[PDB]
Design a binder for this molecule. Sequence first.
Ligand SMILES: *[C@@H]1O[C@H](CO)[C@@H](O[C@@H]2O[C@H](CO)[C@@H](O[C@@H]3O[C@H](CO[C@@H]4O[C@H](CO)[C@@H](O[C@H]5O[C@H](CO)[C@@H](O)[C@H](O)[C@@H]5O)[C@H](O)[C@@H]4O)[C@@H](O)[C@H](O[C@H]4O[C@H](CO)[C@@H](O)[C@H](O)[C@@H]4O)[C@@H]3O)[C@H](O)[C@H]2NC(C)=O)[C@H](O)[C@H]1NC(C)=O
Ligand SMILES: *[C@@H]1O[C@H](CO)[C@@H](O[C@@H]2O[C@H](CO)[C@@H](O[C@@H]3O[C@H](CO)[C@@H](O)[C@H](O[C@H]4O[C@H](CO)[C@@H](O)[C@H](O)[C@@H]4O)[C@@H]3O)[C@H](O)[C@H]2NC(C)=O)[C@H](O)[C@H]1NC(C)=O
Ligand SMILES: *[C@@H]1O[C@H](CO)[C@@H](O[C@@H]2O[C@H](CO)[C@@H](O[C@@H]3O[C@H](CO)[C@@H](O)[C@H](O[C@H]4O[C@H](CO)[C@@H](O)[C@H](O)[C@@H]4O)[C@@H]3O)[C@H](O)[C@H]2NC(C)=O)[C@H](O)[C@H]1NC(C)=O
Ligand SMILES: *[C@@H]1O[C@H](CO)[C@@H](O[C@@H]2O[C@H](CO)[C@@H](O[C@@H]3O[C@H](CO)[C@@H](O)[C@H](O)[C@@H]3O)[C@H](O)[C@H]2NC(C)=O)[C@H](O)[C@H]1NC(C)=O
Ligand SMILES: *[C@@H]1O[C@H](CO)[C@@H](O[C@@H]2O[C@H](CO)[C@@H](O[C@@H]3O[C@H](CO)[C@@H](O)[C@H](O)[C@@H]3O)[C@H](O)[C@H]2NC(C)=O)[C@H](O)[C@H]1NC(C)=O
Ligand SMILES: *[C@@H]1O[C@H](CO)[C@@H](O[C@@H]2O[C@H](CO)[C@@H](O)[C@H](O)[C@H]2NC(C)=O)[C@H](O)[C@H]1NC(C)=O
Ligand SMILES: *[C@@H]1O[C@H](CO)[C@@H](O[C@@H]2O[C@H](CO)[C@@H](O)[C@H](O)[C@H]2NC(C)=O)[C@H](O)[C@H]1NC(C)=O
Ligand SMILES: *[C@@H]1O[C@H](CO)[C@@H](O[C@@H]2O[C@H](CO)[C@@H](O)[C@H](O)[C@H]2NC(C)=O)[C@H](O)[C@H]1NC(C)=O
Ligand SMILES: *[C@@H]1O[C@H](CO)[C@@H](O)[C@H](O)[C@H]1NC(C)=O
Ligand SMILES: *[C@@H]1O[C@H](CO)[C@@H](O)[C@H](O)[C@H]1NC(C)=O
Ligand SMILES: *[C@@H]1O[C@H](CO)[C@@H](O)[C@H](O)[C@H]1NC(C)=O
Ligand SMILES: *[C@@H]1O[C@H](CO)[C@@H](O)[C@H](O)[C@H]1NC(C)=O
Ligand SMILES: [Cl-]
Ligand SMILES: [Mn+2]
Ligand SMILES: [Mn+2]
Ligand SMILES: [Mn+2]
Ligand SMILES: [Mn+2]
Ligand SMILES: [Mn+2]
Ligand SMILES: [Mn+2]
Ligand SMILES: [Mn+2]
Ligand SMILES: [Mn+2]
Lengths: 690, 924, 32
Amino acid sequence: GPNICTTRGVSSCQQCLAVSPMCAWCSDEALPLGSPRCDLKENLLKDNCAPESIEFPVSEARVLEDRPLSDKGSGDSSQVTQVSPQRIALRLRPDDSKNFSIQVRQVEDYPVDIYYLMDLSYSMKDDLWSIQNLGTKLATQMRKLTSNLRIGFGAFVDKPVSPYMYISPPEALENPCYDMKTTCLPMFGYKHVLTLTDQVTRFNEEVKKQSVSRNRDAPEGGFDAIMQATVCDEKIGWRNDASHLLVFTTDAKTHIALDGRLAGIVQPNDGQCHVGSDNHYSASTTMDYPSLGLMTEKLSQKNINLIFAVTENVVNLYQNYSELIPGTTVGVLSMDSSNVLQLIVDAYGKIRSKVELEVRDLPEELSLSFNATCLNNEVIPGLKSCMGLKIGDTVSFSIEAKVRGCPQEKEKSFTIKPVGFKDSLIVQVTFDCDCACQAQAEPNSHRCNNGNGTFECGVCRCGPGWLGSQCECSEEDYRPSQQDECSPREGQPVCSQRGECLCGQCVCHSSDFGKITGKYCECDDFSCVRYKGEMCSGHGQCSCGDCLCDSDWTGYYCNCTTRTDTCMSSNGLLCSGRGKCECGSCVCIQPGSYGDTCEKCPTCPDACTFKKECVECKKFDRGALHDENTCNRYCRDEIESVKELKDTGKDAVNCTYKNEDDCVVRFQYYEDSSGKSILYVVEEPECPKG
Amino acid sequence: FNLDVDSPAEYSGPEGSYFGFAVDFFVPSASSRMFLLVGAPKANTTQPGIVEGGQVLKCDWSSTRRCQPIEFDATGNRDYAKDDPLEFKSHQWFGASVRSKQDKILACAPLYHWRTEMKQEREPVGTCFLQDGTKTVEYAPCRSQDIDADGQGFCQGGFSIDFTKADRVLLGGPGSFYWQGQLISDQVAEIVSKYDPNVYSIKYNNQLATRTAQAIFDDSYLGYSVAVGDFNGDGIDDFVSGVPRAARTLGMVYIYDGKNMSSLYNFTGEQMAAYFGFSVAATDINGDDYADVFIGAPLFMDRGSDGKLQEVGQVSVSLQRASGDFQTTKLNGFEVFARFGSAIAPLGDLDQDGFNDIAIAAPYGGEDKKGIVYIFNGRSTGLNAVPSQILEGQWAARSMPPSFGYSMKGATDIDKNGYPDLIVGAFGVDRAILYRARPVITVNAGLEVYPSILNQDNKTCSLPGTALKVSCFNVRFCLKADGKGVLPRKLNFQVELLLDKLKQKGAIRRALFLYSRSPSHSKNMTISRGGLMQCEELIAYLRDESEFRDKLTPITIFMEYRLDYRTAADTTGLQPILNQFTPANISRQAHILLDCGEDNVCKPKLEVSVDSDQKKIYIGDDNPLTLIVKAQNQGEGAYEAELIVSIPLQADFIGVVRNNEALARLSCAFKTENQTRQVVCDLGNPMKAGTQLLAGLRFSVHQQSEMDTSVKFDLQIQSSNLFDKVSPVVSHKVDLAVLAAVEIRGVSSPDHVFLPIPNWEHKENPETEEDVGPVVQHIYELRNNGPSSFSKAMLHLQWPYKYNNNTLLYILHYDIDGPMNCTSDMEINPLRIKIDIHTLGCGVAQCLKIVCQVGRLDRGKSAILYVKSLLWTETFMNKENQNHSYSLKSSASFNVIEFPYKNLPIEDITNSTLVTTNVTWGIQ
Amino acid sequence: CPRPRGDNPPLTCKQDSDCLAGCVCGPNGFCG
Ligand SMILES: *[C@@H]1O[C@H](CO)[C@@H](O[C@@H]2O[C@H](CO)[C@@H](O[C@@H]3O[C@H](CO[C@@H]4O[C@H](CO)[C@@H](O[C@H]5O[C@H](CO)[C@@H](O)[C@H](O)[C@@H]5O)[C@H](O)[C@@H]4O)[C@@H](O)[C@H](O[C@H]4O[C@H](CO)[C@@H](O)[C@H](O)[C@@H]4O)[C@@H]3O)[C@H](O)[C@H]2NC(C)=O)[C@H](O)[C@H]1NC(C)=O
Ligand SMILES: *[C@@H]1O[C@H](CO)[C@@H](O[C@@H]2O[C@H](CO)[C@@H](O[C@@H]3O[C@H](CO)[C@@H](O)[C@H](O[C@H]4O[C@H](CO)[C@@H](O)[C@H](O)[C@@H]4O)[C@@H]3O)[C@H](O)[C@H]2NC(C)=O)[C@H](O)[C@H]1NC(C)=O
Ligand SMILES: *[C@@H]1O[C@H](CO)[C@@H](O[C@@H]2O[C@H](CO)[C@@H](O[C@@H]3O[C@H](CO)[C@@H](O)[C@H](O[C@H]4O[C@H](CO)[C@@H](O)[C@H](O)[C@@H]4O)[C@@H]3O)[C@H](O)[C@H]2NC(C)=O)[C@H](O)[C@H]1NC(C)=O
Ligand SMILES: *[C@@H]1O[C@H](CO)[C@@H](O[C@@H]2O[C@H](CO)[C@@H](O[C@@H]3O[C@H](CO)[C@@H](O)[C@H](O)[C@@H]3O)[C@H](O)[C@H]2NC(C)=O)[C@H](O)[C@H]1NC(C)=O
Ligand SMILES: *[C@@H]1O[C@H](CO)[C@@H](O[C@@H]2O[C@H](CO)[C@@H](O[C@@H]3O[C@H](CO)[C@@H](O)[C@H](O)[C@@H]3O)[C@H](O)[C@H]2NC(C)=O)[C@H](O)[C@H]1NC(C)=O
Ligand SMILES: *[C@@H]1O[C@H](CO)[C@@H](O[C@@H]2O[C@H](CO)[C@@H](O)[C@H](O)[C@H]2NC(C)=O)[C@H](O)[C@H]1NC(C)=O
Ligand SMILES: *[C@@H]1O[C@H](CO)[C@@H](O[C@@H]2O[C@H](CO)[C@@H](O)[C@H](O)[C@H]2NC(C)=O)[C@H](O)[C@H]1NC(C)=O
Ligand SMILES: *[C@@H]1O[C@H](CO)[C@@H](O[C@@H]2O[C@H](CO)[C@@H](O)[C@H](O)[C@H]2NC(C)=O)[C@H](O)[C@H]1NC(C)=O
Ligand SMILES: *[C@@H]1O[C@H](CO)[C@@H](O)[C@H](O)[C@H]1NC(C)=O
Ligand SMILES: *[C@@H]1O[C@H](CO)[C@@H](O)[C@H](O)[C@H]1NC(C)=O
Ligand SMILES: *[C@@H]1O[C@H](CO)[C@@H](O)[C@H](O)[C@H]1NC(C)=O
Ligand SMILES: *[C@@H]1O[C@H](CO)[C@@H](O)[C@H](O)[C@H]1NC(C)=O
Ligand SMILES: [Cl-]
Ligand SMILES: [Mn+2]
Ligand SMILES: [Mn+2]
Ligand SMILES: [Mn+2]
Ligand SMILES: [Mn+2]
Ligand SMILES: [Mn+2]
Ligand SMILES: [Mn+2]
Ligand SMILES: [Mn+2]
Ligand SMILES: [Mn+2]
């Protein structure tokens, strides 16, 4: 009876469903009483109006297509499926939330496409070693991770204009190495050479012909190539349901967007395909370089993974660039690395070591929460991403969808999908803001007392003044014997304040700067808390003294963000693994740890304590990580037993512990010197005498 | 907020000429007229053999909007030989920059290509032309005998230009020295006196210029943008330039001295590829006579609400202080891909408020990607980051985006109206728009209601008609105005009066105007200007008592003013505008006499009380202090009661408690006016007799220049009565306390050593580390966590040096990380090395101690001691043979001796820790 | 060793006479 739904729901049907999801409204057309027509689903036991004419919508998370996750992506006779479900229907009443979950799997033997962008400038003359026999170099790597491989490549030098181009004596138009007293090729912006095929033979043949050209300035602007290789889908030959790898080789630094003003080029990139039948980027001379933001967009749209295959003098550079294009990797290219002939299976290993969720076309008044179950029922709230995965694993995310108010719009479809995969979960959203009886039984100049009732089904409200269930609320101040208890307890004054109650119905409505409402005018709409001089911290709407936070903000004040990026360490783990992320700032829990991301801890035990647990579960099949089944996920370092050899002193990080068998095991770990921190174990531990 | 967007001046150039790529004002000394300069760097010319030479147009104002080219050259390509031309003017982009000092017009052609006089080439040294009335000279400081991009071959000089106070040209060329970039400055007189049409590379005396640097600085593009201002001591303008590919495409901004071209200050970008330094601007925004730096990064990527990078662009705002340093804030864009920091244009004082204003542009933003210009008003605090006006481009794309706002010029009063104006160019549509400022009017209004407490028993106005008296009163409303600039001398306003507006919503209105017999009255009013508050009067009355109830709510008199803008003709109605931060209405309340006693007058007895319940707050932290207040009115009714809590500078108001039903929720509001700051809580209107209220007010503190020793609040109740209107002021203080949660932590790395040690052999005289033993490392950390800091503390380390005259943990070296100096009572590393269980502490072993002096540790800082030792293996063989395992125990204690908070209670903070290195045999 | 400027590689190398300024002879045939 005396409940929150009995304060604002009494006005109409629309405004009943709007105030709470728990509210229920009865427009019987047969049984009026004088009780509130919007109380609750159960408080309508008496005054039943049960079979119809009870309006109580309930939200629904309805699955329309959930194909089973594929086990392998190699000709499964249909529709390789890496995400389930694929389509959900959402019915949402105002201020109600309904949650669901989504399953993501990186299948084994997924098809791989590789397109190569080669710097063909003069500086690259001493770098063409990396491109001879490339097809045999590429099939040899990827064959271990996939059948059905496809490769292709293109070339780029720079914009063929001044000041980049050699326009010096016309003998330099067709041979820009004229002055060098040798010969090379005329320059070009971006030249598509070989569409993606499965013919390694034609690849090596077409590659061996390639030779360098010449321009003036060290920046070369492959970003023109990266853009066109991404958005010219039919020309490049990208396949659906195949990971798309785009490799970028270059000698030195690169032109960025707005470098073209020196060339008299002031038209921004449109991110449209401009390669045609000549296989040349036609707009190279009319269109500026692309910006990192547009490159990121078009890269995520077309689901392309950008790999920077650059020389060491410039590896630090593109590393810092890759941090501005999330999901891109850098790899050194020099015939001493012991990794150069892989360089890609290592990149594709990285790219598949993480699954992150992205949202497209999300309706504005809708907001989404996220939990993550990354490792065997370890629910991690707030995360839409899982870290350190091997190709083949499966992860799951629990999603909640919330709507503030009710848009009163048509159906809208937004997408939820992994970064870099075609597979997607499409969510169809419909909002149930109006009751069943809307245009069925509504009065106009009748159906009430004196020719004024209108405005809804179930009760008739009257004109601009003198409203009522019997249409007159006369402006006269009829003396007592009419109150209707427009107050809580009848010892309290007329409706809470700001209102002089007339005709048994409070007449507060005293517009000052914000709106006032409620049967007792208890609601304010402008008395919500302030964090710093801004109501609801500026990130939240105010309704009846309660902050209703925006999409990515939470809290009584709406000053706590749902972000986790600022909590992310340089290593990819949030709060360096030693802390919790609350409101975008790491709360370090592990003792002795501090810093922005709990990175600083000089009282923490030496790494010999954390890696001893890996050698116990990997090499002795016991320990903590063995019991929790976390060994294969947490111990991604390779472990190789050695010949009792502990040879070099080069950072020489040696460890020594004592197992349950009272045997003294000792190992060392080469840290990430030329790689990813391998660790060697001395077989034959020291055990006691017989 | 005062630019006229209604009917601005539209200027149009030829199609495809990039008309509007550069704009400026022309304000010569020989004419009281003023003009617009609009560069068309793609326009065609009558120059023979020259396709798309480019023009600079002189645009007439005051009528006809006509633009005629200014002919600087008219000459085709000069010759080096018969068929060997020396220069190439086709596609030279003449007009990509235009600047003007009073009679001088400097225009440049940054794509001007030049054959050298050494070998046949086409080098874009670029050129400039300086016109002064009829005299026209050629300025090409990059066209010299230093060629070929090892030098100035690709200078593209004139890419950016500017003038200083003393008629000195500043020129930027980004291609010099393998695109390192270059700045060049010359006296205008030296430019015109030294001109010689038969000399192509001209030596200018008194020239300033940067030099080539190391090849690491290649491809930095110094001279992309230039602005001028003085930053060190004199009046001599110093040089500012944007270099947006510097610092590994972080971007940078160089400032050079105006007298000898030496490095002065540097600004570095925060994010790569953002183009920090695409544009710069110098102007004084805080009215402190010190010029301030503005730097635009149009491609900056910030974090959206979700946390993803988005290209919104960012403008850096750096305020110059006399110390030489800079207070730099940042200002992000509002729409994605809008390129918000593209152009920055000082406007002078668009409002004539006393603080200069600026305009920032997003040429690719808005609807249909048609360009936006935001204007930001300066105040004493710096720049106001919230725009006060937004200019939207009106022209839709033909082939390329109308880049509305790509070029802007301000700070020139073209209409002589007292307020400067603003040119904006959109070279995508070959147009340039001129916005005219408006005469801001500040208006102060009044409202006087004669006796505010109305008796219904007192009827004196027989005037209603039919000669029956009634209770009446007077509504007197005054209205004064004033405003800088040129604007009509008599202003016309439309005042409206509303009686008892608080219940116009359908309830009865219980006061009417005497003659009109209605709640509403309107009157066209006309005031001249300048502080003579002109007033008018009316008569309102209370309707008959029998006609209504509800005596307790007040009669609110509402007055608003309009100021019809049909005035201010004289050039197409440059209509004035009211001050943006001014109320368009005033209200005042009247009360019906009720329950005021025998004196016929309401006299309250107001009391205010306060209790602590939270007796001490700590210094370093931000403390949830809650005050419980009791406001009583023990006398007669109080009209418009408000609780006034005057807080000091340390305090901020959080809000009212709503989770203790015993405490009443109040409408409180934070107000900062009249040089004070306080919180205003409504206590009832009227606040009836014997009423008691309890409520909670929450706050926050900073302690504001420490050692204050107390925070003071003052509380009193104020009411609009005539007698006994206020309560006694009650001062409540809360004591500042010192709390420092200091801890000491330690770890051994390794924490164990298993004997025997691999590959060890007794050396008679050991030299290397490998000869002595393994490496044991103790690390001690002194971490200050509590809110309050400390100034000084000691730290004492006890170390087990020897046992039975035999070394255990031979300290090799020690390091310190933090505010700390240490000293060991024994020489460290005497021998100069290069590179159950029985416990051994100081109680049973010879100890070596290390004493450390700790400086100031704040709330989240710490000091750390790294001890690198070597296990003396020789000791653990002879008499410690096999079944003797040892625990090498060291300890560290600290004592906090001093705090910066004098005059406060100070409690000693001491603790200790211990660190073991356990040596064990792995046999038996 | 100085780094080449512009769009230029290290020169070439047969012996350390072809290279200058304290660089080396790369096995690939360049300065380095
Ligand atoms: C704002 O930022 C600006 C850039 O970010 C700062 O400007 C930079 O300031 C540096 C500090 O002065 C300055 O470094 C000095 O450069 C000059 C250049 O003159 C040279 O003369 C030689 C022949 O022409 C060559 O130098 C030799 O050394 C280089 C390596 O440095 C070798 O690679 C060369 O082969 C050559 O053998 C150069 O080619 C160059 O033309 C040097 O003379 C200076 O020498 C001083 O430092 C050395 C230590 O290296 C001292 O032992 C010696 O006694 C000198 O004091 C400096 O190396 C940068 O050139 C300059 N860059 C630019 C673009 O202006 C600016 O200072 C900063 N301002 C503020 C307020 O923060
Ligand atoms: C200043 O004056 C110059 C005068 O030379 C003027 O430059 C000329 O512009 C026209 C049109 O913009 C150019 O005409 C073109 O010529 C090329 C061949 O060089 C054609 O390919 C062009 O397109 C044709 O072919 C297409 C088929 O692919 C057709 O679809 C299209 O409709 C055309 O038929 C076009 O004919 C002309 O070459 C230049 N002249 C030069 C560069 O010397 C310039 O535009 C003027 N500038 C201003 C601002 O007024
Ligand atoms: C009964 O009601 C009538 C009207 O309803 C009321 O008549 C009013 O009387 C008051 C005082 O007796 C008058 O108010 C003042 O009169 C003096 C006369 O010397 C003036 O000096 C006053 O000037 C004011 O305004 C100045 C400019 O702002 C101020 O500087 C100054 O301080 C004063 O505030 C003021 O006019 C009032 O004029 C009459 N009104 C009428 C319509 O006659 C009468 O007082 C009531 N009596 C009882 C017993 O209830
Ligand atoms: C959002 O704003 C609120 C209020 O402005 C902030 O809450 C206040 O701060 C913390 C919670 O973060 C609470 O703890 C208080 O601080 C000390 C610090 O050591 C703590 O030890 C005490 O327990 C003390 O209570 C504080 O009570 C709380 N106060 C209120 C009224 O909420 C909150 O921090 C802000 N959040 C963000 C993300 O900005
Ligand atoms: C190296 O050897 C020393 C020698 O014992 C270890 O020191 C610690 O000494 C304390 C004495 O206060 C003991 O801790 C105690 O453990 C019992 C349970 O075994 C507990 O009931 C007591 O309340 C107290 O905590 C103990 O001897 C020992 N500490 C531990 C944890 O065993 C020291 O721990 C050894 N170092 C290493 C790395 O093993
Ligand atoms: C994500 O984890 C949170 C962790 O609490 C859970 O959601 C909330 O759990 C507790 C219930 O004891 C409360 O904070 C809320 O009632 C829960 N929120 C709900 C149900 O929306 C739950 O495991 C996950 N929640 C979501 C929204 O995914
Ligand atoms: C170039 O000018 C600057 C500033 O004008 C000189 O730096 C200092 O200038 C102040 C006066 O402005 C003198 O009081 C200082 O003694 C100067 N510093 C010195 C002499 O080291 C600078 O010396 C000038 N010359 C250069 C940079 O070569
Ligand atoms: C020294 O440090 C100890 C802890 O290492 C602290 O004293 C104890 O702290 C906890 C409570 O947080 C409990 O073990 C005891 O109640 C405390 N003992 C006391 C207060 O005597 C404290 O930081 C320091 N204590 C002293 C006496 O110096
Ligand atoms: C919503 O709550 C949790 C959140 O993860 C979820 O596991 C549960 O299945 C959901 N409950 C309903 C009734 O949808
Ligand atoms: C890359 O970034 C680091 C800091 O993150 C910086 O110290 C380093 O100099 C940068 N190097 C390049 C080549 O950008
Ligand atoms: C006030 O101005 C309006 C504008 O037309 C006019 O209609 C009205 O009659 C005027 N009244 C007086 C009193 O000047
Ligand atoms: C350490 O020594 C230096 C030089 O003697 C001195 O300037 C500094 O203040 C000392 N620090 C402390 C914390 O005593
Ligand atoms: Cl190289
Ligand atoms: Mn190279
Ligand atoms: Mn180049
Ligand atoms: Mn100066
Ligand atoms: Mn200033
Ligand atoms: Mn101003
Ligand atoms: Mn003006
Ligand atoms: Mn009285
Ligand atoms: Mn190159």
